[PDB]
Design an enzyme around this catalytic site. Sequence first.
Site, PDB file in Angstrom:
ATOM      1  N   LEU A  38     -19.643 -56.304 -33.228  1.00 42.29           N
ATOM      2  CA  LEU A  38     -18.975 -56.227 -31.917  1.00 42.29           C
ATOM      3  C   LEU A  38     -18.734 -54.789 -31.439  1.00 42.29           C
ATOM      4  O   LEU A  38     -18.503 -54.576 -30.227  1.00 42.29           O
ATOM      5  CB  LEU A  38     -17.633 -56.976 -31.994  1.00 42.29           C
ATOM      6  CG  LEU A  38     -17.647 -58.452 -32.451  1.00 42.29           C
ATOM      7  CD1 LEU A  38     -16.176 -58.975 -32.716  1.00 42.29           C
ATOM      8  CD2 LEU A  38     -18.392 -59.299 -31.405  1.00 42.29           C
ATOM      9  N   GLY A  41     -18.820 -47.191 -34.909  1.00 45.63           N
ATOM     10  CA  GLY A  41     -18.425 -45.779 -34.790  1.00 45.63           C
ATOM     11  C   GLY A  41     -18.791 -44.884 -35.967  1.00 45.63           C
ATOM     12  O   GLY A  41     -19.691 -45.211 -36.753  1.00 45.63           O
ATOM     13  N   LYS A  61     -12.767 -55.564 -39.431  1.00 48.97           N
ATOM     14  CA  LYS A  61     -12.969 -54.116 -39.331  1.00 48.97           C
ATOM     15  C   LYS A  61     -13.368 -53.618 -40.729  1.00 48.97           C
ATOM     16  O   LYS A  61     -12.649 -53.880 -41.724  1.00 48.97           O
ATOM     17  CB  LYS A  61     -11.681 -53.467 -38.815  1.00 48.97           C
ATOM     18  CG  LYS A  61     -11.789 -51.968 -38.653  1.00 48.97           C
ATOM     19  CD  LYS A  61     -10.602 -51.448 -37.788  1.00 48.97           C
ATOM     20  CE  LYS A  61     -10.718 -49.974 -37.545  1.00 48.97           C
ATOM     21  NZ  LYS A  61      -9.688 -49.541 -36.476  1.00 48.97           N
ATOM     22  N   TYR A 111      -9.684 -63.127 -33.961  1.00 46.98           N
ATOM     23  CA  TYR A 111     -10.740 -62.754 -33.011  1.00 46.98           C
ATOM     24  C   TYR A 111     -10.306 -63.130 -31.596  1.00 46.98           C
ATOM     25  O   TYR A 111      -9.900 -64.271 -31.363  1.00 46.98           O
ATOM     26  CB  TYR A 111     -12.054 -63.475 -33.387  1.00 46.98           C
ATOM     27  CG  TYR A 111     -13.174 -63.285 -32.367  1.00 46.98           C
ATOM     28  CD1 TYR A 111     -13.570 -62.010 -31.950  1.00 46.98           C
ATOM     29  CD2 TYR A 111     -13.827 -64.392 -31.814  1.00 46.98           C
ATOM     30  CE1 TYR A 111     -14.600 -61.840 -31.002  1.00 46.98           C
ATOM     31  CE2 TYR A 111     -14.888 -64.213 -30.884  1.00 46.98           C
ATOM     32  CZ  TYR A 111     -15.249 -62.947 -30.493  1.00 46.98           C
ATOM     33  OH  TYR A 111     -16.283 -62.743 -29.580  1.00 46.98           O
ATOM     34  N   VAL A 112     -10.396 -62.189 -30.660  1.00 44.38           N
ATOM     35  CA  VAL A 112     -10.017 -62.434 -29.251  1.00 44.38           C
ATOM     36  C   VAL A 112     -11.316 -62.490 -28.417  1.00 44.38           C
ATOM     37  O   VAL A 112     -11.897 -61.448 -28.082  1.00 44.38           O
ATOM     38  CB  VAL A 112      -9.052 -61.339 -28.768  1.00 44.38           C
ATOM     39  CG1 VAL A 112      -8.553 -61.660 -27.338  1.00 44.38           C
ATOM     40  CG2 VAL A 112      -7.839 -61.249 -29.711  1.00 44.38           C
ATOM     41  N   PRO A 113     -11.805 -63.675 -28.014  1.00 46.07           N
ATOM     42  CA  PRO A 113     -13.159 -63.765 -27.421  1.00 46.07           C
ATOM     43  C   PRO A 113     -13.259 -63.311 -25.984  1.00 46.07           C
ATOM     44  O   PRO A 113     -14.378 -63.208 -25.460  1.00 46.07           O
ATOM     45  CB  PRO A 113     -13.532 -65.254 -27.526  1.00 46.07           C
ATOM     46  CG  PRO A 113     -12.496 -65.941 -28.191  1.00 46.07           C
ATOM     47  CD  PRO A 113     -11.252 -64.987 -28.382  1.00 46.07           C
ATOM     48  N   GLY A 114     -12.154 -63.059 -25.296  1.00 44.29           N
ATOM     49  CA  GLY A 114     -12.228 -62.718 -23.868  1.00 44.29           C
ATOM     50  C   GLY A 114     -12.744 -61.330 -23.576  1.00 44.29           C
ATOM     51  O   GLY A 114     -13.036 -61.049 -22.415  1.00 44.29           O
ATOM     52  N   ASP A 155      -3.182 -44.411 -29.234  1.00 46.53           N
ATOM     53  CA  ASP A 155      -4.577 -44.684 -28.851  1.00 46.53           C
ATOM     54  C   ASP A 155      -4.641 -45.633 -27.658  1.00 46.53           C
ATOM     55  O   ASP A 155      -5.593 -46.435 -27.551  1.00 46.53           O
ATOM     56  CB  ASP A 155      -5.386 -45.225 -30.037  1.00 46.53           C
ATOM     57  CG  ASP A 155      -6.891 -44.907 -29.939  1.00 46.53           C
ATOM     58  OD1 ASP A 155      -7.269 -43.982 -29.202  1.00 46.53           O
ATOM     59  OD2 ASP A 155      -7.694 -45.526 -30.652  1.00 46.53           O
ATOM     60  N   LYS A 157      -5.881 -46.970 -24.336  1.00 51.25           N
ATOM     61  CA  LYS A 157      -7.049 -46.854 -23.456  1.00 51.25           C
ATOM     62  C   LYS A 157      -7.559 -48.274 -23.217  1.00 51.25           C
ATOM     63  O   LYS A 157      -7.239 -49.177 -24.002  1.00 51.25           O
ATOM     64  CB  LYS A 157      -8.146 -45.988 -24.091  1.00 51.25           C
ATOM     65  CG  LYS A 157      -8.636 -46.468 -25.471  1.00 51.25           C
ATOM     66  CD  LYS A 157      -9.645 -45.502 -26.095  1.00 51.25           C
ATOM     67  CE  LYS A 157     -10.136 -45.975 -27.440  1.00 51.25           C
ATOM     68  NZ  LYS A 157     -11.254 -45.154 -27.991  1.00 51.25           N
ATOM     69  N   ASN A 160      -9.061 -50.702 -25.978  1.00 53.99           N
ATOM     70  CA  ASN A 160      -8.228 -51.219 -27.065  1.00 53.99           C
ATOM     71  C   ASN A 160      -7.342 -52.379 -26.618  1.00 53.99           C
ATOM     72  O   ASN A 160      -6.495 -52.834 -27.407  1.00 53.99           O
ATOM     73  CB  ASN A 160      -7.409 -50.082 -27.713  1.00 53.99           C
ATOM     74  CG  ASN A 160      -8.239 -49.190 -28.577  1.00 53.99           C
ATOM     75  OD1 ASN A 160      -9.387 -49.530 -28.933  1.00 53.99           O
ATOM     76  ND2 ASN A 160      -7.663 -48.064 -28.978  1.00 53.99           N
ATOM     77  N   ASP A 173      -6.634 -51.830 -32.695  1.00 54.87           N
ATOM     78  CA  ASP A 173      -6.949 -50.465 -33.149  1.00 54.87           C
ATOM     79  C   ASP A 173      -5.701 -49.602 -33.388  1.00 54.87           C
ATOM     80  O   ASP A 173      -5.205 -48.898 -32.484  1.00 54.87           O
ATOM     81  CB  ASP A 173      -7.957 -49.740 -32.252  1.00 54.87           C
ATOM     82  CG  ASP A 173      -8.567 -48.524 -32.958  1.00 54.87           C
ATOM     83  OD1 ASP A 173      -8.086 -48.142 -34.064  1.00 54.87           O
ATOM     84  OD2 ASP A 173      -9.562 -47.942 -32.432  1.00 54.87           O
ATOM     85  N   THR A 190      -8.260 -40.259 -27.071  1.00 50.11           N
ATOM     86  CA  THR A 190      -9.399 -39.950 -26.223  1.00 50.11           C
ATOM     87  C   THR A 190      -8.996 -38.957 -25.123  1.00 50.11           C
ATOM     88  O   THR A 190      -7.846 -39.002 -24.613  1.00 50.11           O
ATOM     89  CB  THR A 190      -9.981 -41.267 -25.601  1.00 50.11           C
ATOM     90  OG1 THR A 190     -11.269 -41.021 -25.022  1.00 50.11           O
ATOM     91  CG2 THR A 190      -9.108 -41.894 -24.499  1.00 50.11           C
TER      92      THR A 190
HETATM   93  O1  LIG Z   1     -15.897 -50.389 -31.520  1.00 48.53           O
HETATM   94  C1  LIG Z   1     -14.504 -50.653 -31.184  1.00 48.53           C
HETATM   95  C2  LIG Z   1     -14.361 -50.966 -29.703  1.00 48.53           C
HETATM   96  N1  LIG Z   1     -14.814 -52.382 -29.572  1.00 48.53           N
HETATM   97  C3  LIG Z   1     -14.861 -52.971 -30.948  1.00 48.53           C
HETATM   98  C4  LIG Z   1     -14.248 -54.326 -30.985  1.00 48.53           C
HETATM   99  N2  LIG Z   1     -13.100 -54.813 -31.505  1.00 48.53           N
HETATM  100  C5  LIG Z   1     -13.076 -56.161 -31.312  1.00 48.53           C
HETATM  101  C6  LIG Z   1     -12.071 -57.110 -31.660  1.00 48.53           C
HETATM  102  C7  LIG Z   1     -11.979 -58.416 -31.308  1.00 48.53           C
HETATM  103  N3  LIG Z   1     -11.005 -59.262 -31.657  1.00 48.53           N
HETATM  104  C8  LIG Z   1      -9.958 -58.726 -32.428  1.00 48.53           C
HETATM  105  C9  LIG Z   1     -10.045 -57.400 -32.782  1.00 48.53           C
HETATM  106  N4  LIG Z   1     -11.040 -56.537 -32.435  1.00 48.53           N
HETATM  107  N5  LIG Z   1     -14.191 -56.607 -30.683  1.00 48.53           N
HETATM  108  O2  LIG Z   1     -14.978 -55.381 -30.450  1.00 48.53           O
HETATM  109  C10 LIG Z   1     -14.093 -51.967 -31.825  1.00 48.53           C
END
Ligand code: A1JE7
Length: 339
Positions: A38, A41, A61, A111-114, A155, A157, A160, A173, A190
């Site tokens: 998803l 970095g 992560k 997981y947040v799908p939106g 952080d 922005k 996030n 994040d 940033t």
């Molecule tokens: O590269 C960075 C910016 N975008 C990435 C990302 N984080 C998520 C996510 C989804 N649900 C819960 C937590 N994190 N999806 O993409 C992380």
Amino acid sequence: QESVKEFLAKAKEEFLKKWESPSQNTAQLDHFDRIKTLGTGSFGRVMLVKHKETGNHYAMKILDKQKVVKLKQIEHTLNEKRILQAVNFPFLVKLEFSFKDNSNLYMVMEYVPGGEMFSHLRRIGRFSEPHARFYAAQIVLTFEYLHSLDLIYRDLKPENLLIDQQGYIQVTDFGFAKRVKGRTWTLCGTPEYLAPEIILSKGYNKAVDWWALGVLIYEMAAGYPPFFADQPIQIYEKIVSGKVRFPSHFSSDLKDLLRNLLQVDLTKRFGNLKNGVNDIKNHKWFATTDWIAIYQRKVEAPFIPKFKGPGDTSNFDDYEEEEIRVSINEKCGKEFTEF
Ligand SMILES: O[C@H]1CN[C@H](c2nc(-c3cnccn3)no2)C1
């Protein structure tokens, strides 16, 4: 306000109990199937995974220990996990499991799908003031919570801020979040969102989060950030000058709030005065906001993201898919003992 005082006192008690005795080692990698990258970095990435026994989806992560060491992020990664396992608030993503192996550190979140707010903002151009105000109110409450636990976020922005199935924000994040009672010194964040006292290498405090809220509100309501320029050195010159131009479509109340959040002198900045957050909550721009109803998630959201179910990835973009390799030898064991 006694009700708010007693809420925050209980919030701090519950945080401290988890902070002093952190959870560790609550899952392992072969309990999950990997689905899709998803984002990615310089020392980490976030994947969509599925738990093999329950079928639940999560955002995992993954941080490479050797790369964390080389980029001088050891303390920041230990902060991130220790804070995330200890917090609990309606607008913070929830950490469900964490663990490590010979090569990597893992944080398994809901997981947040939106998708990111950033994607939605850039697609529509700008948000109306009521739409920007609904999201801003959630950030004000979340910063009131974090700051009362002596946490700085550092952080903020649009990337996030995830949009959930009800249209509410989930902040993710915590890689720069830190427990601070007074001042701290690290250069991080940033460029477009940095407060002047960070750029000038000062010992700074939680007032940097209120500055960043001013940048976020401006960018939501204009469609671009207030100190925009082509390269960082030019952005920093505009920030420290603090000269800001507002679009004529901004209301007078919005301009007045932003002049008080984007105040270069930290001792004069809203959120950092004798009345703290209440100077923000009582400002005319927030006169229509029902703070209790927002916290209880009883307000109808301005926008519900389009997605098909808890496994849909269509609101995130496409990255080259790389292996999750695990060495047969332990790397950096001493540095990450507490994780
Ligand atoms: O590269 C960075 C910016 N975008 C990435 C990302 N984080 C998520 C996510 C989804 N649900 C819960 C937590 N994190 N999806 O993409 C992380």
